Structure 1
Amino acid sequence: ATQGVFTLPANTRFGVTAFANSSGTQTVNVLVNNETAATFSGQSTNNAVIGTQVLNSGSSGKVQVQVSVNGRPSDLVSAQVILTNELNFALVGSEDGTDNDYNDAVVVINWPLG
């Protein structure tokens, strides 16, 4: 099944934050309405924040997370969780190798903001 694709309400501010846990440099692309809206790059084996930003979901509300390492797309796992019918998390894990810890790039999207 497709992973890393989330439907947000239109024109909504959301945060997006990426963490790295791999010897390979992580490239995180965030797409809104099928266009690149943010790009994060960094390397860490200690969960360093390689990027954090506020974006807008635009007229379509379609948000997609893509992760690649040295040009190779990583395998993604994802899910969305809603607390008290209000607080939204869109969660992404990714695996760039063979150990399947799926933390190599960890991306957290949250809304609403403010």
Structure 2
Amino acid sequence: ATQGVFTLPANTRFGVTAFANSSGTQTVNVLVNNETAATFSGQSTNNAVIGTQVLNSGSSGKVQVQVSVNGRPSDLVSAQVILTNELNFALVGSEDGTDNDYNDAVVVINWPLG
């Protein structure tokens, strides 16, 4: 199944943060309405924040996270969870190798902000 795609409310600001747990350098692309809005690169085996920014969901509200390492797409896992019917997390894990810890790049989207 498709992973890493989330439909946010239209024209809503959200935060996106990325963490790295791999010897390989993680590049994370966040696409808004099928166009790229932010790009994080970094290497870390200790969960360092390689990127975090605020973006707007736009007309569409379509948000997609992709994870490449050295030009190889990583296998993604994802889900959205909503607490008290109002606080939202869109969650992405990814695997770049064979150990299946799916933490090599971890991406957290949260809204609303402010």
Which TM-score band (shorter chain)? Answer: over 0.9
Q: Which sections of structure 2, spanning at least 5 residues, go unmatched?
A: none
How far apart are residue 24 of structure 1 and its match?
A: 0.0
Q: Output one character per residue of 1:29-61: Cα deviation in whole Å (capped at 9) or x when no partner.
A: 000000000000000000000000000000000
Shift of 1:104: 0.1
Following the alignment from structure 2 to structure 1, what is the Cα–Cα distance between the partners of residues 7 and 33? 10
Whole-Å separation in 1 of the counterparts to 2:88 and 2:42: 26
Alpha-carbon distance, 1:10 to partner = 0.3
TM-score (norm 1): 1.00
What is the CA deviation profile of residues 5-46 of structure 1, one whole-angstrom value per residue up to 9, with x for unaligned ones? 000000000000000000000000000000000000000000
Displacement of 1:108 in angstroms is 0.1
Moved over 3 A (4+): none
Superposed CA RMSD in Å reads 0.2
Rounded Cα–Cα distance in structure 1 between residues aligned with 2:55 and 2:61: 11
**How far 1:68 moved relative to its partner?**
0.2
The answer for unaligned runs of 5 or more in structure 1 is none
Normalising by structure 2, report the TM-score: 1.00
Cα displacement string for residues 61-93 of structure 1 (whole angstroms, at most 9, x for unaligned residues) = 000000000000000000000000000000000
Q: What percent identity do the matched residue pairs reach?
A: 100
Counting matched residue pairs gives 114
| Separation (CA, whole Å) in 2 of partners of 1:9 and 1:82 | 13
